[PDB]
Design a protein around this ligand. Sequence first.
Ligand SMILES: Nc1ncnc2c1ncn2[C@@H]1O[C@H](COP(=O)(O)OP(=O)(O)OP(=O)(O)O)[C@@H](O)[C@H]1O
Ligand SMILES: Nc1ncnc2c1ncn2[C@@H]1O[C@H](COP(=O)(O)OP(=O)(O)O)[C@@H](O)[C@H]1O
Ligand SMILES: [Mg+2]
Ligand SMILES: [Zn+2]
Ligand SMILES: [Zn+2]
Lengths: 663, 420
Amino acid sequence: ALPSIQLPVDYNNLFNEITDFLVTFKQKGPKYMAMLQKVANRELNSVIIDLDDILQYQNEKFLQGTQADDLVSAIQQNANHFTELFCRAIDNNMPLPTKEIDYKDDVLDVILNQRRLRNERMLTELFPPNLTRRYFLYFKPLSQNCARRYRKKAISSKPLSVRQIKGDFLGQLITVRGIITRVSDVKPAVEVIAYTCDQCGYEVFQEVNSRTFTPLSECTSEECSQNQTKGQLFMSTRASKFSAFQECKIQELSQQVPVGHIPRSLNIHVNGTLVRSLSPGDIVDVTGIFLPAPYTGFKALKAGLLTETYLEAQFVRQHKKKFASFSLTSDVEERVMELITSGDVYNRLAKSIAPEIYGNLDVKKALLLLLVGGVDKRVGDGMKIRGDINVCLMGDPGVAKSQLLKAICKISPRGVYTTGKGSSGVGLTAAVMKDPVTDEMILEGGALVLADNGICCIDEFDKMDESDRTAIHEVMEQQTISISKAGINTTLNARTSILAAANPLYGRYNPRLSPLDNINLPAALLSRFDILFLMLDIPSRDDDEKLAEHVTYVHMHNKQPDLDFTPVEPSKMREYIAYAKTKRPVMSEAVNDYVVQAYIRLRQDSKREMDSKFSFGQATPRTLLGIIRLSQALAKLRLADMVDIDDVEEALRLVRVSKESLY
Amino acid sequence: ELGTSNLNLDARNLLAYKQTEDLYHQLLNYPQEVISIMDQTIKDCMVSLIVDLDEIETKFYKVRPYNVGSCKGMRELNPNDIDKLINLKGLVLRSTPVIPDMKVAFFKCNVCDHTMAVEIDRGVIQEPARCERIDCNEPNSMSLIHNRCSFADKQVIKLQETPDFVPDGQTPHSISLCVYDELVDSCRAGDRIEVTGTFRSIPIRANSRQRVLKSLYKTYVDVVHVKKVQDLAKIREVAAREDLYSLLARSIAPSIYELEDVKKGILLQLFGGTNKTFTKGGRYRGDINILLCGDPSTSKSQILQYVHKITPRGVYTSGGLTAYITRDVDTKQLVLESGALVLSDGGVCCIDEFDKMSDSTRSVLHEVMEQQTISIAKAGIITTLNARSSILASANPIGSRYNPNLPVTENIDLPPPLLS
Ligand SMILES: Nc1ncnc2c1ncn2[C@@H]1O[C@H](COP(=O)(O)OP(=O)(O)OP(=O)(O)O)[C@@H](O)[C@H]1O
Ligand SMILES: Nc1ncnc2c1ncn2[C@@H]1O[C@H](COP(=O)(O)OP(=O)(O)O)[C@@H](O)[C@H]1O
Ligand SMILES: [Mg+2]
Ligand SMILES: [Zn+2]
Ligand SMILES: [Zn+2]
């Protein structure tokens, strides 16, 4: 039949040591008594056990010649059995409730009390403990400094990659590291399944741990056990016990993949209160149990010994970074006090964005004014006004406008970079097309990538086809996206700033009429944009010399040079942009005459647009709207709830300098 | 005095009383039994209050409780809330045809042509193994009759969460819905509704050949409540005013400065002419079509939006617009779908960016104005459809400006007959 082998592990002494540790441990008295007491009062919902506590307790008790074996090693070599032992030990020593309980809400306990008041009145079934349990058992991996405290190599941890895990690690406790890409929804799963027995005394119970379940047909009720049936047993949803279930997969990082290889994947299961503790697109290090899963679910009658494997989550560190929604704290309050004491700030912020690229202060100032936003939140009668600024960058190849775009995208949490094709699921369609395993065809219809309060950045703005160009024509001026294909009208409220970088298809500027170059795009789209800035490469010794010296000094140090002098830091301005957006100044009336006469002189300029050769000086009311928005932004970025005429003057100078690059 | 059978019941008024809040909590825990006993109580209360007894024995009584709790989303639904009342807001994605539901079986002893009616419970039917007539008493002579039974109309509604619950560009989630009787067809595609009902879970059959069941249960919500999100005397008082024309013209566009004549024309074409179909001569067009041209600095799209939302029926499109045979996505069938122009029968069809109209669709317009009837001959389907719609379009000149010296035809780039 089954031959037997001898192992140096016997569970009785281990269980006794577990009970002794759980009762006697001193880190308030015993921690493990206080937490169990809070569990008894229906306050706590999960149990976490620190293996470092067990290790240090055993190490300090080894000073007396009583201990004989180690338990953390057995935990590492096997975990699920010790989970069962821990829950048995906890249920054995569960304390009394020292607090009052709202006892009427526990419908499961009310039902069980009714069942008992039935059965024991006639003088009863021993219900399994897992049905009555309310807590969850979780583990916590050791810490490397704790291992260094002693000579022994009780290490664990060591966040192996997905591909570095091999077949002999099954059953142990391991830690993985990677990026989360897919997270499924929350779905309830059964733990104990109960059947009602049609008034035939006790209601038969059943317990299943496999992923496949089979129901009952006949019951052991005494009158049902009689020679003829008494009612057909039915499954009752109220009496049974459930548990939240969620599954995800994790991808290997691009750093850890050996050259010439494709990254692998790893499924992960999470149950209990840890559900919804992770989101797609973050770097984490999960600790859990590596378990096998039968291949019989596919039901091919093949793979006689081949089986699938998955990880069971126990503890996760979210890692990465936190945006925190600029939650107010004292430290950042003194930081903004320092910024206020710093005086004029916008020039420093412009200097501090991209020191790698030399000069180009106007574009950095424009980006800073863009990061705050223009006037928004509507006007009287409901007329639409959009606070996002639409600026386009013109320049020949080799000006590092793409590098500056990458810098602004990295430093802005809402930035997104797109381009003409290359990837198809980025424009005119959502990312949930034909995604679910059921091919449920989840879709919103007409939508873009994070178009709400986003910063869309595009390189080669002349490259994309008619579809994306029509998409931009739909997004013009915060207009909603209303493209329908199958009766759907779930429009996405697009409110985003537009960042466009492109070049004339000749790749260089020309002495002839400048609108002939423009963007090789319709003029209607061009008139939409708020600020047009041209970067023309002019061969000059006194400027190219400085540019070359700066670039070679950057290269020589293999780091950012000390040649730059920026008191501000990228995270510093990351906090300050949110701080300045929070202040939100409102408009003032005394500038209406000034802006009206400025618009009159702009129309005077339009009277001379036929002079040609830089014909971009055309007539548009959106020019007045844009100058108003830019004055609002020039009041927003640094000033308090006040709009100054100097803001209008600075906006006018910005417009003039933007036109000046034409020559 | 009305004869209907319908009750509305708010929870807050139900909450205001001290004895009733206990019934409130018990309703939260046990919906079905409380609702059933409440309906029985109302059935008794009708007779207790009338003291014609004939209209009561035919009708039933049901309640429609609402506002039990705050609206919860699909992103936070713990398994602890199974078999409890919750409120949901969402947008309807798709409906389904009525699904007959078995309620009463009809059997027949084919040997002796004897029939009996059998009730069912929980869907499962206990088949009788022998005919009740002991005179024949044969076991295998009992056969079911499908079309002589009684049925109920079940319908499944697909619901999506409102977009306000997704702050960080995630994807929405879909929750299935179930309705009964008067709730059938109460919602259509694109409707924004709020519902009140209990939660439910059900096992999945997996393989239909065996009795194996998956460890995961599908979740769906059964609801009992839905909500969405002599004036002629006043007319003639206004109709007697002398300067009603100017005020009515200027009321359509409150923010547009000047442009009075175009506003008058647009209002008058919104009023529309007459239509007549005298036999010996044929029908005459009653629609009015207007075109707008100018540089893109006139806010001419704002007037398009104004007329689109003011008019009773109208479709606002851009530069496909007519009927075409389509392949149904979710179901592998073939469905005929009507276009935007057909959908604007009797209203105003709004067209924006009329210059970039391609070339294949323009002829379609050349067909729809001079005859107002479009035909299609594809996939073996030959038919004619009525449009009878008004057109109002906007166009832009070629170049940054419209030069007054050049005539209109060159700048707009439209065929002379279509403009004519
Ligand atoms: N002023 C500058 N300071 C520093 N580096 C610069 C500067 N101008 C260009 N570069 C260099 O240019 C490279 C990136 O610029 P890039 O060629 O992508 O610009 P682009 O104008 O967007 O062109 P393209 O469309 O051809 O990619 C980097 O290697 C960067 O060092
Ligand atoms: N007389 C006006 N009154 C108010 N707003 C105007 C006026 N003229 C132009 N505008 C503004 O300028 C814009 C003109 O755009 P428009 O010419 O309608 O674009 P399109 O190319 O879609 O026709 C409008 O959005 C409007 O806000
Ligand atoms: Mg580039
Ligand atoms: Zn029974
Ligand atoms: Zn018979």
